[PDB]
Symmetry: C2
Subunit: 128 residues, 2 copies
């Protein structure tokens, strides 16, 4: 699993606060920012993301939003960049005010395997 992150730093945003909102969900991300504010990120550990989804009891929405964003061997979801500043995950649309576009690239593992690892059925009996 490779984690690709995309979003923007608008003229009125702080670079520090956007990099931290991103890191609050994906701590090991390396970010590059273009002259025009484009944010290109790459992460790997799903630990924190999984930890938060469970602590906030939102696996129901997570499991669903993952299915919806599944296209091929890639899964694209959108997280509210603002709520992420306080390490809180909110799934939103692509037109939000902008969001953190996260694109999971599945190398070997099958999709089904990915769904139950991130957002398994009930808060129960989960793969690791």
């Amino acid at each position: 699993v490779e984690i690709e992150i995309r979003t923007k730093i608008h003229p009125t945003e702080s670079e520090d606060k956007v990099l931290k909102a991103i890191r609050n969900i994906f701590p090991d991300a390396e970010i590059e920012i273009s002259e025009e504010g484009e944010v290109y990120g790459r992460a790997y550990s799903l630990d924190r993301f999984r930890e938060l989804l469970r602590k906030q009891r939102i696996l129901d929405t997570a499991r669903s939003e993952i299915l919806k964003g599944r296209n091929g061997k890639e899964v694209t979801i959108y997280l509210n960049k603002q709520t992420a500043t306080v390490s809180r995950i909110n799934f939103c649309d692509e037109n939000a005010v902008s969001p953190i576009k996260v694109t999971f690239r599945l190398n070997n593992i099958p999709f089904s395997r990915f769904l139950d690892y991130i957002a398994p059925e009930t808060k129960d009996g989960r793969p690791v």
Copy 2:
């Protein structure tokens, strides 16, 4: 004997307070601004010198004039300015859902609306009052 200028917008968590305020003041340099604990911005301005200058130096009076009209309600005119472009004092009229904008409501107390229009956004290079 006045034009009341009311500024409204917000400062979201990932936004910088300094940048938002300067963006507002790039358009209205003498803005009196207060920020609620939730990030709601409330400002009050008076001079329209900077606003007229920029609409002219940027050659945008046709869009300005039409938008002033499209946003009239009687004695209150409401327009929406792109907050991002205002950071470099570039005036861009937008909608209410811009990814927030600067809501600017002009309160025309004892100055006729028709006269306000020709003062901020006159017709094709025509007569200009002071």
